[PDB]
From a paper:
[name] organizes the rotationally ninefold symmetric cartwheel, an early assembly intermediate of centrioles that participates in establishing their symmetry and diameter. The cartwheel is organized through the homo-oligomerization of the highly conserved centriolar protein [name]. [name] is a highly conserved protein that is found in all eukaryotes that have cilia/flagella during some of their life-cycle stages.
However, with the wild-type construct of Lm [name]-697–320, we finally succeeded to find a crystal form of the space-group H3 that diffracted to a resolution of ∼3.5 Å along the l-axis with anisotropy limiting the resolution along the h-k plane to ∼4.2 Å. Using the structure of the Lm [name]-697–274 B–C homo-dimer as a search model, a molecular replacement solution could be found that allowed the subsequent placement of the coiled-coil part present in the construct. These three dimers were highly similar to each other and overlayed with an rmsd of 0.88 ± 0.29 Å in secondary structure matching with 357 ± 14 selected pairs. The inner diameters of the [name] rings are ∼19 nm and correspond well to the diameters of cartwheel hubs observed in vivo. In the crystal, [name] rings are stacked onto each other. Neighbouring rings interact through inter-digitation of their coiled-coil domains in an antiparallel way. The ASU of the crystal contained six [name] monomers that are labelled from A–F. No clear electron density could be seen for the distal part of the coiled-coil of the A–B dimer, probably due to the lack of stabilizing crystal packing interactions compared to the C–D and E–F dimer. However, we demonstrate that under high protein and precipitant concentrations, a [name] [name] construct crystallized as ninefold symmetric rings with a diameter very similar to cartwheel hubs in vivo; this provides the first unambiguous experimental evidence that [name] is able to form ninefold symmetric cartwheels on its own. However, in our ring structure, both of these critical interfaces are similar in their orientations to those observed in the crystals of the Lm [name]-697–320 F257E and the Lm [name]-697–274 constructs that did not crystallize as rings.
Residue numbers in the entry:
A (entry chain D): 130 to 317
B (entry chain C): 129 to 317
C (entry chain E): 208 to 264
Write the structure that this text describes.
Amino acid sequence: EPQTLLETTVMVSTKMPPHEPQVRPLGVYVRTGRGGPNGVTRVVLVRLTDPTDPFFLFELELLEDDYNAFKQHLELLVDFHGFPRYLVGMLRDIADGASAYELSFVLNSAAVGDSNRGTLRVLETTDFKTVEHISLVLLRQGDAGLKRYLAERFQHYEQSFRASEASRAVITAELQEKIGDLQAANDA
Amino acid sequence: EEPQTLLETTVMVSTKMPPHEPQVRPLGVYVRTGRGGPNGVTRVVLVRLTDPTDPFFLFELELLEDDYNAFKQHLELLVDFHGFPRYLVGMLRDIADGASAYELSFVLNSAAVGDSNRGTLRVLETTDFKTVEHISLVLLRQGDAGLKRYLAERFQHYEQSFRASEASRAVITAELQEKIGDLQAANDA
Amino acid sequence: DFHGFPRYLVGMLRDIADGASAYELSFVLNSAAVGDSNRGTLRVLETTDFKTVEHIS
């Protein structure tokens, strides 16, 4: 049953205090599926990546059971099913340029190697002030987890490359064979 | 004079995790000369062994030109540092291509890949009398940091190669569809 | 700036009192009775389908 609701790139204001923030394009991947202690809990996963840096991998994994606390702390007004649906709605809207909002990501230290987390925020600028719409703490991944990520994406695109070899090979042949039919129609 | 992949292919290898019974698997073999070492200006030979069915199966022997004389004496080799990878690869390519009578073997120092930190790679000749060993190389399993680079490297590679095949498909799918519409109208005439 | 803060604050609150605002006012004390409290948090809240969005505190 797992399902990716969003997988795209978006400019994000990343900040490693006390350094000055700087805008980078970042990957956003959001996927629902199954996990937890006994592997039968519904999960929502939020994943943040940097195409310019393979080790830049921050994730929030949310188990359905922990959600009531989550909904309360963040004052959400949707159930576990709508949360990732609205989150990607909000984020995709920003990435699409249809949003007045901007994306921000603040790490808990001045360097990436010493950080273990970041707070990703959806921010609105008004004349009065920046208004915060949502806040999520994302944890930086551990190596073993990370190896899987790379290895996962490694295996993924290797297949996808081969698949395009198959598509190129079949369609090259169909339409190349079509020249010969329509060559005889020209002869007519 | 400049770095070079001398070999990058797949070949059947007899893999053995003692005390378990050996088993034959297809393994990746990559052999590359280039620059490396303590000060990064030493000529190196790299031998890399992989398993397409297993991303963590990543074993390497890295050899520095400074270290080679010991290597040469110990293994009773009769070529210099420059010829060694050409002949190693000569031998391996002969095997992968099927032109060799020889076989490949890889024996781990433990019962699981997870518990190993090394393996011995051997080129073996079967005779009526006995197995005759032609060469043996110990390869070390990589530390996490090394491996993450390998995966990330291969990650970025095939992501691009995929993108390129979309471009190639786009070229051929679009032109040839454009040709169908032209000559389909020529049939209509 | 300091000059605008009360203008926008009052802008926001006055907007609410007149009924021209979509926003609501909230006040949460640090205890269960007024006699034991010494403070409260006053918030301007926006209701969305997704969540309450806080505008000022």
